[PDB]
């Protein structure tokens, strides 16, 4: 809790759905947003901060709260958009040999700034005396170890708590989330959403020699006609859907009502039947 990691993770597809099956978590209360909509929001970089506290202290981890650990080791303001993911770790972090390794900084002068790590080991000076290093009646060790033992009960067990602070500065967002895909349909007028490029057309097989860096493709006069498959390399062609004009030939509503329908721009195989120029 006095020296916690600050892992800056970015440039990946943050799939939070996988975290629901990695370890048997006991608390997944995200205060900022919902996990369903979290996978569809881009971010620049996530700050992962992990620590270990007791079971009765997990409630102290909240966006604004006082306590022996809430305002002395790690404080969260009223803007945390991440989660409070935490899980019990009383399977490998509890042996009967003396657990004098951890600490929680029982002594302090005032509340620390939120989202701050104070890595210090000086002797706590309780005023009215210059303590150049002494341990008696005026200046003591500001650190105290826990008493984690395997043969205990719930509430005072080693609980690993990890928070994921989010930020959105004036920087391009890298971590967006999972990007699913669908099956390919060829020779059929359907819709497409290829890498933001949305539209409709008939994905056909072309014979164009695209450059190894080009992705999209236009025509003589401002019309996208071919794109590169985001999957394995394949050259496609996006031709517009089946469209045309319709005209009605009618001898007039004075002798009969039989009419003829002329579809312009079609070879009678895309709608007696006759094919004219």
């Amino acid at each position, epitope marked *: 809790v006095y020296a916690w990691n600050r892992k800056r993770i970015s440039n990946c597809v943050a799939d939070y759905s996988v975290l629901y099956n990695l370890a048997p978590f006991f608390t997944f209360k995200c205060y900022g947003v919902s996990p369903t909509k979290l996978n569809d929001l881009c971010f620049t970089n996530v700050y992962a901060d992990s620590f270990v506290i*007791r079971g*009765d*202290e997990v*409630r*102290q981890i909240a966006p604004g709260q*006082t*306590g*022996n650990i809430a*305002d*002395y080791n790690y404080k969260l303001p009223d803007d945390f958009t991440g989660c409070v993911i935490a899980w019990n770790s009383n399977k490998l972090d509890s042996k009967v040999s003396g657990n004098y390794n951890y600490l929680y900084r*029982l*002594f*302090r*002068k*005032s*509340n620390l700034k939120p989202f701050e790590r104070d890595i210090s080991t000086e002797i706590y000076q*309780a*005023g*009215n005396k210059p303590c150049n290093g002494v341990a*008696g*009646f*005026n200046c*003591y060790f500001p650190l*105290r170890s*826990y*008493s984690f033992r395997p*043969t*205990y*009960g719930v*509430g*005072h067990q080693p609980y690993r708590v990890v928070v994921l602070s989010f930020e959105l500065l004036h920087a391009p967002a890298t971590v967006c989330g999972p990007k699913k895909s669908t099956n390919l349909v060829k020779n059929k007028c359907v819709n497409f959403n290829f890498n933001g490029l949305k539209g409709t057309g008939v994905l056909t097989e072309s014979n164009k020699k695209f450059l190894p860096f080009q992705q999209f493709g236009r025509d003589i006069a401002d019309t996208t006609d071919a794109v590169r498959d985001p999957q394995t390399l394949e050259i496609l062609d996006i031709t517009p859907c089946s469209f045309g004009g319709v005209s009605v030939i009618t001898p007039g509503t004075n002798t009969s009502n039989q009419v003829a329908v002329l579809y312009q721009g079609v070879n009678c195989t895309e709608v007696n039947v006759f094919q004219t120029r």
Partner: single-chain antibody
Amino acid sequence: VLTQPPSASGSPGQSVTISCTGTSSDFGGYNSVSWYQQHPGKAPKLMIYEVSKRPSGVPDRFSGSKSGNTASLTVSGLQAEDEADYYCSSYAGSNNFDVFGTGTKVTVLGGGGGSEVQLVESGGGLIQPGGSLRLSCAASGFTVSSNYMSWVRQAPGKGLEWVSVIYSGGSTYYADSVKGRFTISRDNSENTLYLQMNSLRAEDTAVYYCARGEIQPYYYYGMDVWGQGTTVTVSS
């Protein structure tokens, strides 16, 4: 709520071995069970804080091992003339007051801190029911603005209980008895630290004690120094 024997007078100093049962657990986390010897008149004095390593005092009271689910403080062979009350502390859970126990009469016979830092109070004689009276414990020695102090009240017959806990500079937790009607306000950071009544509900007649150290999360703090209390004497 803890379990303590009402009285203990048979076999003085041979098989007394008082304790405090009713825990049904492993004392939560840090196993630190303190023992307070409340004496009529002056303020109580600390006797032992851990299961071993007794502080500077009488060396005939030690071996406070935790047997079963209770700390059995070995008191046999101490003396045969004492009139006081032994109180034990447990239940160190997060934000849980009333850690003291009931009145245990450990009088083996029945019939037969002063200049350390400072000891001052307000002297609330004939307190009017209500209003706002301030009580201070100005200490010219240890800093009254950096250490973790507490306020504990006790009434005739009833035992002690946690009434006010205040951390270094960022916590103002109140007990469950007041439930909000008590507001702690710190005085100047270099003069003293006083309290506030804030319209008592006729239950604040108990005498107060401003301790320089915590009770349940007690630290060594060099030495445990207490101060005499004053009678409220409400006239509601």
